[PDB]
Ligand binder design. Sequence first.
Ligand code: GDP
Ligand code: MG
Length: 178
Amino acid sequence: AIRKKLVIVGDGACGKTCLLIVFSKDQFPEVYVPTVFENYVADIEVDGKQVELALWDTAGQEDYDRRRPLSYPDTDVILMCFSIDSPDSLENIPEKWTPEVKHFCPNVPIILVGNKKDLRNDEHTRRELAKMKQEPVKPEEGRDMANRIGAFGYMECSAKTKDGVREVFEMATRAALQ
Ligand SMILES: Nc1nc2c(ncn2[C@@H]2O[C@H](COP(=O)(O)OP(=O)(O)O)[C@@H](O)[C@H]2O)c(=O)[nH]1
Ligand SMILES: [Mg+2]
């Protein structure tokens, strides 16, 4: 199999760890891990090729001991995430995550991922965002942001329902093979 390294980044609580666990284990977790600390390697076949895809989760800003610069070397593809219930997490894509990823991984393909797609139609989410004069992120906003940052693709998924989860990793694997 071809060896590729995937790193997942994005705002705290936008669903990165759960996306890795639901893809790797096919089960939404019941306990809390900030950062997957076991070794996840996925076997993925795309367009006839066997790929071993190492899944690197990341730490937020306060976990200095596992700071992201330690994890960026030799990355083959980036999953850059925001949550559909958080327009703030989307605004951090161009302001925070793209400058950081381009600093450490300037030539690596990016898949822009909108997580928690199940909350787009959730009334708690709708009413909480509406009290801020906000609304859940629309697909066209994700697509526009993909163009802005030069992402290889824009994908939406829900770790909670599994909708779109395998497809995110198949797209990331096809980008890593280029
Ligand atoms: N509704 C919903 N909640 C999710 C989803 N994925 C994760 N969460 C929840 O969002 C919170 C943060 O998830 P986590 O994966 O730890 O986020 P991280 O900080 O980006 O790693 C937790 O309470 C999860 O249970 C999803 O697809 N849908
Ligand atoms: Mg996490």
